[PDB]
């Protein structure tokens, strides 16, 4: 197993951890903010996924400071992850094209 496949797996694990903690911490941050909708665990988990994927349906979002702080970690974890899968797919295509010219 090459470094880039394990970084990928690692990031997918790490991202899942961030999605889970993020759910739990989002609810902890938002309860007590009048008007908040990010306040039960099941839908925070859905919220954290749509935040890490940057799909932003706008059905749920944080309205407190620490909720927003939690959100940023999820977006960056989400974006770095999906980006690392790409950097991993590129080293693969690049290695497979250097065997394809002998090198």
């Amino acid at each position, epitope marked *: 197993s090459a470094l880039h496949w394990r970084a990928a797996g690692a990031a997918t694990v790490l991202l899942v951890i961030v999605l889970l903690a993020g759910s739990y911490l989002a609810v902890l941050a938002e309860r007590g903010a009048p*008007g*908040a909708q990010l*306040i039960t665990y099941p839908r925070a988990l859905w919220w954290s996924v749509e935040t890490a994927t940057t799909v932003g349906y706008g059905d749920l979002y944080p309205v407190t400071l620490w909720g927003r702080c939690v959100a940023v970690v999820v977006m960056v974890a989400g974006i770095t992850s999906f980006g690392l899968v790409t950097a991993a797919l590129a080293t693969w295509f690049v290695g497979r094209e250097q065997e394809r010219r002998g090198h």
Partner: antibody
Amino acid sequence: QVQLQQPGAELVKPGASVKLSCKASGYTFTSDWIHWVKQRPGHGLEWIGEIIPSYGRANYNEKIQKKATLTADKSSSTAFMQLSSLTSEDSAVYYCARERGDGYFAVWGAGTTVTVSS
Amino acid sequence: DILLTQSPAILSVSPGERVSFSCRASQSIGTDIHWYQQRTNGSPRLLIKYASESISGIPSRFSGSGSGTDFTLSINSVESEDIANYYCQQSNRWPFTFGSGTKLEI
């Protein structure tokens, strides 16, 4: 089983305070929230506040005079509500309820009957 | 805060008839409404969660419908054990809130 155990009654002199308890059994998860609800005789249900015992954060109903302080003892799975400086407006039954973090109160205590009198 | 309105406050029905309790919320709350029964000198008991989902231990006789701002709890064929106060409760927005209550009268 009985999941929330509350004392049946407390008498409180006007101006004094009192600490209601609520011992939980059954499944206790780290996600669990303990809520407290006030019901004046012949009136309805009134949400007072909530605490998450694993972490210790508590939130209160801002719309009513904040008479309460919420604490919890992780060791004994017991939640405390400290009502202070009581008047006859505060005489009521106080239920505790358990919410799994999914928005509904699955189970309730039998409630404690707080009487403010001399 | 979300305000849950329960009108009418009392409901007179004859035995075996079907009865319906109305919860109206002051804004759309999806299906995040839940129904409780409270008999005389008892504590509240959960009947229906998330508008319509059944709780085990609860008679088939009890059902719920609704979404958005209009919510209904129904009892196909009332009987005497159903005499109580019935409360709704929302979990869409913080803080949770309760309806004012409806009494069932046979």
